[PDB]
Amino acid sequence: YFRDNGKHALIIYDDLSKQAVAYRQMSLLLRRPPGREAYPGDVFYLHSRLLERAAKMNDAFGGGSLTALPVIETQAGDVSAYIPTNVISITDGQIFLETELFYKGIRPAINVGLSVSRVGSAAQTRAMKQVAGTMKLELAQYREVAAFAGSDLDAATQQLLSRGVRLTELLKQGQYSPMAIEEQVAVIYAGVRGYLDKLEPSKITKFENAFLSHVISQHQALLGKIRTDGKISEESDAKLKEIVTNFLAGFEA
């Protein structure tokens, strides 16, 4: 309704795993023969026809949209199972969550390597594109050296490990405090530009809290300009640099 009336709506199916279970029961008791994991032959078409209905309309049809966020629960990480493999092939991307990372302190527990988005930077504000553009490969270079390292590493490869560890710490986030995009760019900026490379990894989380609240209370004009302009201005880049470097040395002591 919103989609067809020039409005934007977000739907969340929590979860399509339990829906498939319900449909299987129906199909089995209607005496339709079972297939893989007892599921009916049309269980893929069940979810495909649903998620295809999410779309972005052209301006002649209203310019409205419908974004879908299906949820799938796996069993012991088995991404190979019948149901999950269907929904992965349907969607424009997946956000992978793991218990190992969850209990390692990585919350949200997003496996960055496994997680992708096919739309990409075309779904980002000009500000976020500047900071996150490098992050992808920079973290990919890190994960390569992560399962590659105490035999002592050279200066170059130890640097790649340091950067990756510090960016990972910035991707940590608590619950029920969704961040505005200008506040996100600022904290990513400090990590991606190496201003935290020689900071002890345990205090990055502590750094972000105090750093952001200082920028929130004393530098609204900076955040406001990044918000409204939609990108990092040359003057804003200079000001961000001015704050992070001086905050760094105070925090380090």
Binding site: A147, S151, T157
Partner: peptide, 9 residues
């Protein structure tokens, strides 16, 4: 090899 012993070996 470089997965366990490292590049130095």
């Amino acid at each position: 090899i470089i997965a366990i012993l490292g590049m130095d070996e």
